[PDB]
């Protein structure tokens, strides 16, 4: 199926047929910290999220949340 | 809540950083001259060349840190000064605060320091680009040109006086001082034999524009005996005098900041100059001309149509973009890119003191960093692969993956992706030009960002990709830590400077 | 700033309330999202 | 120095401290201000008793006072600010704060510990919280950071590590997307998220990095992500035993996230960023075979076209910003009608503002959707590996123009240029792609030209102006095109990278799963009667407008393109699988050896088969959900935020005899073409006479069966 | 000039708020009010959005 | 070229002297003389040339302390801008 494997120089930092013995722990220590970083980013961004009203809700035109035109 | 302490700290930092640099240079020069009978390197581990290199590098770096602090102090000071002037409306009250000078160090050239955002941006560019170029020139300085280790310190001092002075004559003299060190570097440090002729072309082409600017300065000084750079408010030049001054100023400063057709010297010098000095030239030495043009044209009142100057700038952009395709030499291709970016920047200054200056300043900064990145990549390619020609170089990525990745990311940044000061500057300039002349804006954008971009990308992609089957015994290894971190710092600045305070942009 | 939408009457508001509609009202940030919350800082420490 | 003794002492101290806290709380409640009168009584015996019985409280207060003193000192040292509230000496401060016990008035150790424990409790999370705050962002960031960090740290993550990490991230992202798909499409849920103030774009302007998860965004996002999950699962088998599988996987993930960002863009700046990112990542995928310079030529062709599209998009955005001092998508959509009447003074002509803006947008959309003239790069982009080709050609790269039109529909509704150009170019592209695909001989080229034809049909559907029909067409085409691409990829891998079916024959037995999967996928893709893909073309012809000046050419091209599907589907399937064996003897012999006979025997991958099966099942389910939402009697689709009503649904709800009989013309054209491709003989065979006889039998039996069904019953 | 640009930015933000809060039905009906008139009245001649120079006579600058 | 001294005194160079051995008997009349120095570089086990091999907490501590200082400095700055000795946390915070 694939091409025949050929030697790769040791000194060269290349990805040809690279397999790591400790890939399980590497994945463990690369996934969870990334998940925590994304959780922090998500909770930071949720402060500036906007959603339309729900099914049973209507926006009162005179409420502060309702859009307001500029007053010269 | 702004207080006089911040004002005095800003002024003291600005004044004392210059003397820090000057004392470092003076001590290093005294040591160099009085340690040896003949001022050349002793080829041994105990040479003074190591001490001089250390002193220059970590004087520039520490002065750069102090410059960061002083620039931040200046930003706060200028913002609060504008607030103090603007806020109060009572007719009896007026902001008249007078500052007394320190008694520790004197005022260099008996001049009171005045600092602006554009000047400090130029000074920051000087610091960073000088640091990169000095890091590059280590392999070039050997045993008879070690005296040129101080060239960047001399450049820093000249630029410091250039940007922290309110005197027209001192301004012009600082602008004109830059020629000698640059010519000496190109003449004595350039490996290629064609550098000898390239240096002469550089000198003559730049000196023609220097003479033009000298004529303009003579017109201003002889007519207006003032030199304070602010008394010009009370003197108005007639139409003929004003048109002569603007023409002379534009042509003279465009000789330095390459414009069509005056870029033959730039191409020659970039091709035949040291790879470490090309970085400094393109990054910084062509923007002192822009700063001087801005100062003079905003000080003088001009009642002429700028269509001719805009046409010259646009023609330069178009010419460089069209010629990009036909260059197999990476250094010459980067030189054409520099010409294109500089012409766009110069075009940004063709509407006097309008809002185009902000885009021009931002584009000057991004072009400095981008040109430094590109010339450093060319330097790495030439130093490890002993050629900088597309025909002789191919498949860089497969033997030096980091270098190929750097080339690819350099191309992406050059394309002007959002999130980069390059994109921000393009947005500023094109947003203004669309209303100024939409058809001209379309032509400029089309040419520069399609035809020139494709010509630029063809050579770099061909070099990066392919299969390096030739001379397998002589293939290099990879980038070093120094080169890798320089590339990373260029990328980091290009990305993060977009978060700089928007008050000044 | 001034109201942009056309005004409605309190009688109309009461009619809508009887019909069963509710007035849209922004809700406070939950303790997990609130950055000034003991829950938020406990999460940070953990 | 015993751990057991330390633990026992700690537990005893905890119990004593808790009891003291409860006692102090009760006494403080009773003696809010008079508690000191008994706590700090001058009596030596009482003082000693109180100190002994509240030692845990006193030691805790002393530790708290010391910590607060040191913290205040640190803050003063760092900030050059004030004193510790006052200038109290160390001894006075520490004594006062240690004697003071009111700090424990509302503090209970057990309650505090219980609160700390329940803070992390996951039982609390509810659907209502998820509905209020979208977790789509959390998972998309997870996928993005996983891809970026996996690219950087390749040595740490081997082949298996990269695969598993990205698989987990992408699965989580897809599950969250699936959860929110139901709410966004039908429940009228959409979110506008902002990450921060990205950049300054004027003297006092600053655009924020905002995302818009609306129906328009989710329609593309869920399709791309669902296709990408199975393409990702399939790639590990297609690039099996290749030097660089991690690179291909990470490139695919990068392209997916770039397209997701583009579709779910909150403002034109984010849209342009996503545009450039998909262009760059598609370039990398096409140029995956970096060693070859032949691949670089196709990559550079695609790069040049993408840069042209970027120019057009950038110029359009600049025009919009100059007109309205805003880059928000919602604001632009709701404001463009006011400025519709405006004109722009260009070199020597006064161009209508809407017309010029729509011209640039349509130009970039055509370039990225591979319409006629600008499609030249798509056939050459097939140099990419089959997974990359499937992802780019199904719903990721070739649907960018469709997304642009759908998102900025209010602009194009008032565009004369759009009205004239979308149907004509769409129909011409449909006809051209269909016929070229029918006459094509290579599998990937056939799929590419079919993609061009379907993009033309999508343009014509948008011209008709039923966004629901456009979305349905997009979903059907994307799913089934991706599935067919995966099947042909397996076929090519078996045939040793020979993509032409002139060297393919009798592969039905060697690739049993591929044969049947390709049959289903192709009958659905090529609009054929009694298939899920017939309704998209039916609705397109229902909605086709008739006021065009070039209506004759438009309609004829549409008919020819629609019929062209049958020929390419038949040729591909039959030539690949059931034709005479045309391939090299080695291909068959190497796999026909008896030694290989085993329960594990297969010429494809089990993971690949499962991925294709699940993709087909999920595509069927999602298409059925969309059909129920839109084409049902009860219309339950979410708001499209467009005020242009086309009246096309009238001929879907209450069609008239004229239209009902008109559709029969195309139906019978397809029937005759099917009969031709089936019963037509091009080569001598032992079955020539019997084939003619079978045709006669079929004709006569069809006539009699119709007679009995209609009249005799 | 920055203040007029700020007016334009604020009205654009209010339009975005209206779009998110109000469904497409009645959205244009409610926008055909003070808000639409202000959007048009804050056009390029009156506010310098991104143009290099706001061409103002000395009387306009004084105002 | 390089002129620095190889034999440093800050530390002793890791080396292995057993990989290469010098012949000292059984020579012939045509064989060249052996070599005097036959020590080879020996790397520490568990050294991975493909990463930084950095095991110190100095950089992380410096970055974390900088971030914490920035946080507290911003807190104090906000209090000063609001004209209070400390932040006045509100009872409810809304999206914005
Ligand atoms: C070989 C390179 C070649 C380069 C030249 C070529 C260039 C072009 C081609 C490029 C492609 C080719 C090269 C790539 C392959 C390299 C292969 C290789 O070398 O493998 C080894 C390499 C190193 O790993 P290793 O060798 O196994 O071990 C190293 C040590 O063990 C680690 O020791 P440690 O554990 O003690 O860590 C020390 C420290 C690492 O120390 C440093 O790197 C010093 C950094 C000093 C500051 C410089 C500016 C930083 C700007 C932001 C970027 C941060 C750096 C991350 C890298 C860039 C982004 C990808 O780690 C940290 O603490 C990370 C925090 C950094 C944050 C600093 C922020 C400063 C202020 C920035 C501006 C304001 C931001 C406001 C944000 C507000 C809230 C959002 O592989 C990696 O691990 C790759 C890491 C990639 C970055 C991701 C991890 C860090 C994430 C930080 C936070 C950001 C994420 C989201 C946070 C969300 C919450 C806020
Ligand atoms: C699209 C383009 C994409 C391009 C990028 C693609 C991705 C590229 C990925 C690959 C490259 C990047 C990621 C890997 C980087 C390398 C990470 C690594 O681990 O390398 C190992 C690398 C090599 O390891 P090595 O050979 O062992 O060298 C070690 C170093 O020389 C030194 O190590 P050390 O252990 O000796 O630590 C030294 C440390 C020493 O650390 C410490 O001292 C901390 C602990 C003491 C705390 C103070 C205690 C005082 C009281 C005493 C208490 C008792 C003692 C406590 C300490 C006990 C000992 C632990 O000193 C410092 O760090 C000085 C910094 C001071 C200024 C800044 C921080 C302070 C701010 C202000 C604070 C104010 C509040 C505090 C006030 C305090 C009182 C005044 O070491 C480092 O990580 C050094 C840091 C810099 C590394 C290079 C960073 C490159 C970043 C590139 C960013 C590019 C961004 C591009 C963005 C593009 C966006 C479009
Ligand atoms: C604070 C928030 C998060 C902060 C994170 C910031 C991340 C910034 C960007 C990091 C980019 C890292 C690139 C690493 C490349 C490593 C080399 C490699 O992959 O192999 C090169 C391959 C082969 O490399 P190789 O195998 O020869 O060598 C690998 C090992 N080294 C390099 C160390 C020797 O060569 C190529 O052909 C070049 C391919 C380049 C592909 C780049 C694709 C990037 C796609 C990113 C998509 C992100 C979407 C963002 C969406 C949101 C936008 C707002
Ligand atoms: C009228 C007053 C005139 C004043 C004239 C000033 C005389 C300056 C003489 C310089 C002599 C330099 C060599 C000193 C011996 C070095 C011995 C050594 O290497 O052992 C390691 C020891 C100690 O090393 P360490 O291992 O302890 O490292 C810590 C270093 N310090 C102490 C600085 C934190 O000496 C040094 O490291 C000193 C290095 C000196 C060179 C510094 C070069 C950078 C640029 C500054 C140079 C001086 C210019 C003036 C200052 C800048 C401008 C304000
Ligand atoms: C591009 C050429 C090749 C590169 C080298 C550059 C050389 C040229 C540099 C620019 C010189 C200025 C040209 C534009 C002048 C515009 C004003 C003008 O003259 O209009 C009539 C002006 C403007 O008139 P006006 O009509 O606008 O208003 C005044 C009208 N009256 C007087 C009637 C009331 O009229 C004059 O007063 C005549 C002035 C003539 C000055 C010409 C000589 C200038 C000498 C100094 C510069 C010499 C530089 C030489 C450098 C070396 C060359 C090798
Ligand atoms: C005149 C009446 C009005 C209608 C005007 C239009 C007339 C019909 C035009 C039909 C054009 C069809 C072109 C198909 C090209 C397929 C190319 C291909 O893939 O290779 C050949 C494939 C076979 O591929 P193959 O791989 O099996 O073998 C190929 C063999 N060689 C290369 C030697 C040819 O398919 C065919 O051969 C079938 C096409 C030929 C037969 C066409 C019959 C047309 C019948 C028209 C019926 C009209 C009904 C009335 C109503 C019509 C209007 C509504
Ligand atoms: C239907 C979606 C299907 C797909 C879901 C995929 C998983 C998504 C990630 C989990 C949910 C995270 C958002 C929680 C929202 C929330 O706060 O919801 C609210 C609840 C509390 O309810 P209240 O705030 O309403 O009182 O939050 C919690 O209970 C927080 C406990 C932790 C929740 C998981 C955190 C995941 C992040 C990584 C943790 C790493 C731990 C350490 C590893 C070494």
Atom 38 of ligand 5, nearest CA residue: B240
- Contact criterion met (CB below 8 Å) for B495 and B417: no
Residue keyed to tokens 């030529």? D297
Contact (CB<8Å) D120/C46: yes
Looking at residue D576, the DSSP 8-state letter turns out to be: I
Q: Which of D146, D148, D258 to mutate to test the pocket of ligand 3 (most atoms within 8 A of CB)?
A: D148
Contact (CB<8Å) C6/A63: no
Chain C residues whose beta carbon lies within 8 Å of the beta carbon of residue F95: 26, 29
Phi, psi of B261 (to 5 degrees): -95, 10
Cis ω for the linkage preceding B261 (within 30 of 0): yes
Contact (CB<8Å) B43/F4: no
**How many angstroms separate the alpha carbon of residue D682 from the centre of ligand 6?**
13
d(CA B450, CA B435): 21
**Contact pairs from chain A to chain F, CB under 8 Å:** 9
Q: Which residues line ligand 3 (CB under 6 A)?
A: A 13-15; B 397, 401-402, 405, 408; D 144, 148, 151-152, 154, 247, 254, 257-258, 261, 273, 277, 281, 284, 290
Is F69 in the D-facing interface, judged by CB distances under 8 Å?
yes
Residue from A32, C32, C35 nearest D124 by CA = C32
Chain F: residue nearest C36 by CA? F89
Residue from B404, B347, B343, B398 nearest B377 by CA = B404
The Cα of F50 is separated from the nearest Cα of chain A by a number of Å equal to 7
DSSP H stretches of helix in B37-150: 48-87, 117-136
Distinct helix (H) and strand (E) counts, chain B: 19, 0
Is D640 in the E-facing interface, judged by CB distances under 8 Å?
yes
d(CA B143, CA D96): 72
Phi, psi of B113 (to 5 degrees): -75, 135
- Contact criterion met (CB below 8 Å) for E18 and E31: yes
d(CA B372, CA B382): 15
Contact (CB<8Å) D133/C39: no
Is D550 in the F-facing interface, judged by CB distances under 8 Å?
no
Q: What's the 3-state SS for chain F?
A: CCCCCCCCCCCCCCCECCCCCCCCCCCCCCCCCCCCCCCECCCCCCCCCCCCCCCCCHHHHHHHHHHHHHHHHHHHHHHHHCCCCCCCCCCCCCCC
Provide the residue count of chain F.
96
Report how far apart, in Å, the C-alpha atoms of B462 and of each of B329, B465, D193 are: 12, 5, 41
d(CA D440, CA D382): 14
Residue from D612, D581, D586 nearest D509 by CA = D581
Provide the residue count of chain D.
713
Contact (CB<8Å) E15/D335: yes
**How many angstroms separate the alpha carbon of residue B404 from the centre of ligand 1?**
20
Q: Which chains form contacts with chain C, at 3 or more CB pairs under 8 Å?
A: A, D, E, F
Contact (CB<8Å) F94/C34: no
The answer to whether the CB of C42 is under 6 A from ligand 7 is no
Which experimental approach was used here? cryo-EM
Residue from D387, D391, D488, D376 nearest D436 by CA = D376
Report how far apart, in Å, the C-alpha atoms of B41 and of each of B48, B142, B390, F3 are: 7, 7, 37, 12
Contact (CB<8Å) A11/B477: yes
The Cα of F76 is separated from the nearest Cα of chain D by a number of Å equal to 8
d(CA B421, CA D184): 36
Start-to-end Cα distance in chain A: 74
| Pair of tokens at residue D317 | 């955005």
Interchain contact B/C (3 or more Cβ pairs less than 8 Å): no
Start-to-end Cα distance in chain D: 100
Count CB neighbours of A20 within 10 A: 18
| Pair of tokens at residue B315 | 């023609």
Q: Which residues line ligand 1 (CB under 6 A)?
A: A 37, 40-41; B 402, 405-406, 409, 479, 484, 487-488, 492, 496; D 149, 152-153; F 51-52, 54, 59-60, 63
Chain A residues whose beta carbon lies within 8 Å of the beta carbon of residue B401: 13-14
Minimum-distance CB partner of E14 among C4, C6, C24: C4
Ligand 3 atom nearest to CA at B419? 54
Contact (CB<8Å) B43/F5: no
Residue keyed to tokens 């803070």? D119
b/e map of B201-218 (b: 16 or more CB within 10 Å)?
bbbebbbebbebbeebbe
The Cα of C44 is separated from the nearest Cα of chain F by a number of Å equal to 13
Distinct helix (H) and strand (E) counts, chain D: 30, 4
**How many angstroms separate the alpha carbon of residue D247 from the centre of ligand 3?**
10
Q: Which of B401, B406, B413 to mutate to test the pocket of ligand 3 (most atoms within 8 A of CB)?
A: B401
| Pair of tokens at residue D353 | 């503002």
d(CA D186, CA D181): 8
Is B356 in the E-facing interface, judged by CB distances under 8 Å?
yes
Contacts of B299 (CB under 8 A, 6+ apart): B229, B232
Contact (CB<8Å) E15/D334: yes
d(CA B341, CA B318): 11
Phi, psi of D648 (to 5 degrees): -65, -30
Helix, strand, or coil (residue D610): helix
| Pair of tokens at residue D673 | 């073409």
Contact (CB<8Å) F72/D82: no
- Strands C22-23 vs A57-58: parallel, antiparallel or unpaired: parallel
Residue keyed to tokens 């959205």? E27
- Contact criterion met (CB below 8 Å) for D173 and D153: no
Atom 28 of ligand 1, nearest CA residue: F52
Chain D residues whose beta carbon lies within 8 Å of the beta carbon of residue A37: 141, 145
Minimum-distance CB partner of E50 among D322, D328, D643: D322
Ligand 6 atom nearest to CA at D568? 19
Contact (CB<8Å) D641/E24: yes
Range 18-47 of E in CB contact (< 8 A) with B: 44
- Contact criterion met (CB below 8 Å) for B64 and B132: no
Distance of CA D588 to the CA centre of its chain: 39
Q: What angle do CA B436, B439, B444 make, to 5 degrees?
A: 90
b/e map of F16-48 (b: 16 or more CB within 10 Å)?
eeeeeeeeeeeeeeeeeeeeeeeeeeeeeeeee
Q: Which chains form contacts with chain E, at 3 or more CB pairs under 8 Å?
A: A, B, C, D
- Strands A68-69 vs D343-345: parallel, antiparallel or unpaired: unpaired
Looking at residue B104, the DSSP 8-state letter turns out to be: S
Ligand 7 atom nearest to CA at D123? 29
Contacts of B96 (CB under 8 A, 6+ apart): none
Is B401 in the A-facing interface, judged by CB distances under 8 Å?
yes
Chain F: residue nearest B45 by CA? F4
The Cα of C24 is separated from the nearest Cα of chain D by a number of Å equal to 13
Distance of CA F12 to the CA centre of its chain: 18
d(CA E49, CA E8): 8
Helix, strand, or coil (residue D351): strand
In D117-237, which ranges are E strands? 191-199, 207-213
Residue keyed to tokens 């009760």? D26
CA atoms within 13 A on the CB side of D678: 10
Q: Which of F51, F57, F58, F66 to mutate to test the pocket of ligand 2 (most atoms within 8 A of CB)?
A: F58
**Contact pairs from chain C to chain D, CB under 8 Å:** 11
Resolution of the determined structure in angstroms stands at 2.8
The answer to whether the CB of B251 is under 6 A from ligand 5 is yes
For chain C, the maximum distance between any two Cα atoms, rounded to a whole number of angstroms, is 52
d(CA B162, CA B173): 8
Task: Quote the crossing angle between the two packed helices D512-525 and D551-573, to the nearest 10°.
Answer: 170
Give residue ranges of D with CB < 8 Å to any C CB. 115-116, 119-120, 129, 132-133
Phi, psi of B137 (to 5 degrees): -85, 10
CA atoms within 13 A on the CB side of D403: 29
Minimum-distance CB partner of D119 among C30, C33, C43: C43
């Amino acid at each position: 199926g694939g091409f025949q494997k050929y030697p790769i120089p040791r000194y060269l930092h290349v990805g040809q047929w690279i397999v790591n013995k400790n890939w399980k722990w590497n994945t463990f220590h690369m996934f969870f910290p990334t998940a925590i970083l994304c959780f922090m980013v998500w909770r930071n961004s949720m402060i500036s999220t906007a959603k339309p009203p729900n099914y049973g809700e209507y926006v009162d035109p005179q409420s502060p949340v309702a859009p307001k035109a500029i007053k010269y | 809540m702004f207080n006089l302490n911040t004002i005095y700290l800003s002024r003291i930092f600005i004044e004392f950083n210059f003397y820090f640099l000057f004392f470092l240079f003076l001590i290093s020069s005294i040591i160099f001259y009085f340690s040896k009978i003949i001022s050349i390197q002793n080829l041994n581990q105990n040479s003074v060349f190591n001490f001089l290199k250390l002193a220059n590098i970590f004087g520039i770096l520490i002065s750069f840190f102090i410059h960061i602090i002083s620039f931040w102090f200046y930003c706060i000071y200028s913002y609060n000064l504008s607030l103090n002037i603007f806020s109060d409306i009572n007719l009896y009250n007026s902001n008249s605060i007078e500052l007394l000078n320190n008694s520790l160090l004197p005022n260099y050239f008996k001049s009171n320091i005045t600092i602006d955002f554009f000047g400090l941006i130029l000074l920051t560019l000087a610091y960073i680009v000088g640091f990169v170029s000095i890091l590059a020139l280590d392999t070039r300085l050997y045993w008879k040109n070690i005296k040129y280790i101080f060239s960047f310190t001399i450049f820093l001092l000249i630029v410091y006086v250039y940007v922290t002075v309110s005197n027209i004559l001192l301004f012009f003299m600082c602008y004109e001082l830059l020629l000698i060190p640059s010519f000496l570097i190109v003449y004595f440090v350039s490996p290629s034999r064609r550098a000898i002729q390239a240096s002469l072309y550089f000198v003559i082409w730049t000196q023609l524009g220097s003479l033009l600017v000298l004529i303009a300065i003579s017109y201003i000084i002889s007519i207006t005996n003032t030199y304070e750079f602010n008394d010009l408010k009370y003197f108005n030049f007639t139409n003929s005098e004003s048109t002569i001054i603007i023409f002379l100023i534009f042509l003279g400063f465009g000789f330095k900041a390459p414009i069509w057709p005056f870029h033959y010297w730039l191409t020659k010098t970039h091709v035949e100059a040291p790879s470490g000095f090309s970085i400094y030239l393109s990054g910084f030495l062509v923007k002192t001309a822009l700063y001087g043009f801005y100062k003079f044209n905003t000080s003088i009142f001009i009642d002429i149509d700028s269509s001719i100057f805009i046409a010259i700038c646009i023609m330069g952009v178009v010419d460089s973009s069209l010629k990009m395709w036909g260059q197999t030499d990476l250094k010459k291709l980067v030189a054409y890119g520099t010409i294109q970016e500089m012409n766009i920047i110069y075009l940004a200054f063709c509407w006097g003191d309008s809002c185009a200056i902000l885009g021009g300043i931002l584009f000057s900064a991004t072009h400095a960093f981008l040109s430094a990145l590109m010339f450093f990549l060319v330097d790495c390619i030439y130093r490890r692969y002993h050629t900088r020609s597309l025909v002789e170089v191919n498949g860089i990525l497969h033997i030096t993956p980091n270098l190929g990745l750097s080339i690819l990311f350099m191309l992406v940044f050059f394309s002007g992706i959002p999130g980069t000061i390059k994109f921000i500057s393009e947005f500023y300039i094109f947003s203004g030009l669309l209303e100024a002349s939409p058809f001209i804006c379309f032509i400029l954008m089309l040419v520069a960002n399609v035809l020139g971009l494709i010509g630029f990308s063809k050579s770099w992609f061909n070099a990066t990709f392919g299969m390096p089957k030739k001379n397998t015994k002589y293939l290099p290894m990879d980038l070093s830590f120094k080169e890798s971190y320089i590339i990373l710092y260029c990328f980091f600045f290009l990305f993060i400077f977009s978060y700089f305070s928007s008050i000044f942009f | 700033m001034q109201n942009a939408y056309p005004e409605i009457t309190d009688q109309h508001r009461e009619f809508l309330k009887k019909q069963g509609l509710k007035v849209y009202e922004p809700k406070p940030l939950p303790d997990q999202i609130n950055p000034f919350s003991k829950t938020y800082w406990i999460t940070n420490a953990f | 120095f015993n751990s057991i003794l330390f633990l026992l002492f700690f537990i005893v101290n905890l119990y004593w401290f808790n009891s003291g806290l409860i006692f102090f709380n009760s006494v403080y409640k009773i003696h809010h201000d008079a508690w000191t009168l008994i706590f700090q009584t001058d009596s030596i015996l009482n003082k000693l008793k109180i100190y002994f019985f509240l030692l845990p409280l006193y030691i805790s207060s002393f530790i708290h006072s010391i910590s607060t003193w040191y913290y205040n000192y640190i803050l003063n040292f760092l900030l050059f600010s004030e004193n510790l509230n006052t200038n109290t000496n160390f001894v006075d401060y520490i004594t006062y704060n240690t004697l003071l016990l009111s700090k424990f008035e509302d503090f209970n150790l057990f309650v505090y510990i219980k609160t700390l424990l329940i803070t992390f409790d996951i039982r609390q999370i509810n659907l209502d919280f998820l509905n209020e705050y979208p977790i789509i962002l959390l998972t998309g960031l997870l996928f993005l950071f996983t891809t970026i960090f996996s690219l950087i740290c390749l040595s740490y993550l081997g082949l298996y590590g990269v695969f598993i990490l990205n698989l987990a991230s992408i699965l989580l992202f897809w599950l969250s997307m699936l959860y929110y798909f139901n709410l966004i499409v039908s429940e009228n849920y959409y979110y506008y998220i902002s990450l921060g103030k990205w950049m300054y774009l004027s003297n006092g302007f600053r655009v924020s990095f905002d995302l818009l998860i609306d129906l328009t965004s989710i329609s593309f996002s869920f399709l791309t992500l669902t296709i990408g999950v199975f393409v990702y699962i399939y790639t590990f088998s297609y690039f099996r035993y290749e030097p660089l599988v991690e690179r291909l996987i990470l490139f695919l993930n990068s392209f997916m996230i770039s397209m997701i960002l583009l579709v779910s863009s909150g403002n034109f700046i984010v849209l342009f960023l996503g545009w450039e990112l998909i262009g760059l990542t598609s370039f990398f995928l096409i140029n995956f075979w970096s060693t070859r310079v032949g691949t670089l030529k196709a990559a550079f062709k695609a790069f040049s076209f993408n840069k042209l599209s970027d120019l057009f998009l950038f110029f359009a955005i600049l025009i919009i910003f100059s007109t309205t001092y805003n880059l928000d998508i919602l604001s632009f959509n709701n404001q463009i009608y006011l400025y519709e009447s405006y004109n722009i003074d260009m070199f020597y002509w006064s161009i209508n503002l809407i017309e010029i803006i729509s011209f640039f947008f349509i130009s970039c959309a055509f370039i990225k959707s591979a319409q006629f003239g600008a499609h030249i790069w798509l056939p050459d982009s097939m140099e990419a590996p089959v997974p990359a080709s499937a992802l780019i050609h199904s719903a990721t790269l070739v649907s960018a123009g469709i997304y642009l039109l759908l998102r900025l529909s209010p602009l194009f509704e008032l565009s004369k240029y759009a009205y004239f150009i979308l149907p004509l170019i769409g129909s011409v592209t449909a006809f051209y792609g269909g016929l070229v695909s029918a006459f094509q001989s290579d599998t990937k080229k056939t799929l590419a030209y079919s993609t061009i034809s379907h993009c033309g049909f999508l343009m014509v559907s948008y011209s008709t102006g039923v966004l629901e029909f456009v979305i349905l067409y997009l979903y059907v085409h994307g799913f089934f095109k991706a599935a067919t691409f995966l099947c042909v990829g397996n076929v090519n891998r078996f045939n040793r990278n020979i993509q032409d079916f002139k060297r393919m024959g009798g592969f039905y037995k060697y690739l049993p799963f591929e044969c049947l999967a390709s049959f289903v996928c192709m009958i659905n893709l090529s609009g054929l009667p009694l298939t899920l893909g017939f309704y998209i073309k039916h609705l397109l012809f229902i909605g086709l407008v008739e006021s065009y000046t070039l209506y004759p050419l438009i309609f004829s091209s549409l008919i020819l393109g629609a019929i062209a599907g049958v020929f390419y589907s038949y040729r591909l399937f039959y030539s690949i699988f059931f034709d005479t064996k045309k391939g090299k003897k080695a291909i068959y012999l190497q796999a026909s050896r008896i030694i290989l006979n085993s329960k594990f025997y297969s010429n494809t991958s089990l993971a690949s088969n499962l991925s294709i099966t699940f993709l087909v099942l999920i595509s069927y389910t999602v298409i059925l959900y969309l059909y129920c939402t839109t084409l049902n009697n009860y219309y339950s689709l979410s708001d499209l935020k467009s005020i242009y009503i086309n009246n096309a649904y009238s001929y879907f709800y209450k069609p008239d005899y004229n239209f009902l009989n008109a559709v029969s013309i195309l139906n019978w054209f397809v029937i005759i073409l099917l009969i031709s491709v089936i019963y037509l003989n091009w080569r001598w065979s032992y079955y020539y006479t019997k084939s003619i006889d079978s045709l006669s039998k079929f004709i006569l039996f069809s006539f009699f069966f119709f007679i009995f069904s209609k009249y005799i019953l | 000039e920055l203040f007029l640009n700020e007016y334009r930015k604020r009205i654009n933000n209010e339009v975005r708020r209206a779009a998110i809060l109000t469904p497409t039905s009645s959205l244009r009906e409610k926008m055909n009010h003070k808000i639409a008139d202000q959007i048009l009245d804050l056009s390029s001649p009156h506010v310098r959005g991104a143009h290099f120079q706001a061409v103002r006579s000395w009387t306009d600058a004084s105002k | 070229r390089q002129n620095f001294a190889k034999n440093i005194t800050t530390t002793d160079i890791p080396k292995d002297s057993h990989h290469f051995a010098a012949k000292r008997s059984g020579f012939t009349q045509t064989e060249q003389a052996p070599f005097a120095y036959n020590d080879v570089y020996q790397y520490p086990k568990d050294y991975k040339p493909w990463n930084y091999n950095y095991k110190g907490n100095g950089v992380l501590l410096a970055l974390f302390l900088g971030s914490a200082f920035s946080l507290v400095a911003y807190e104090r700055s906000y209090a000063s801008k609001t004209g209070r000795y400390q932040r006045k946390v509100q009872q409810n915070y809304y999206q914005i």
